[PDB]
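User: Hello! I'm new to structural biology and keep hearing that structure can be predicted from sequence alone. Could you demonstrate with protein (bmk M2)? Please show me the input and the output so I can see what each looks like.

Assistant: Of course. The first part below is the input, the amino acid sequence of protein (bmk M2). The second part is the output, the predicted structure written as tokens.
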Amino acid sequence: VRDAYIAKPHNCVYECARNEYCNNLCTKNGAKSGYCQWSGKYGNGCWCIELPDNVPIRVPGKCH
Ligand SMILES: [Cl-]
């Protein structure tokens, strides 16, 4: 497991406005939970706590 921004295709974060939406998105994807980060490494986007290692996360580079 790891803590990170889960990615929607293709290498883009999931933009957000509330913690509840991210918590729902993160746990649907196997996380322990999640919240909206407005000023993290990629800026705005859902951040997930203890996401399974196989689920796609945002990595350096481009979002298509
Ligand atoms: Cl890791």
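User: So the tokens describe the shape?

Assistant: Right, they're a compact way of writing down the 3D structure. Reading them back into a model, for example: Residues 19-28 form the longest helix (10 residues).
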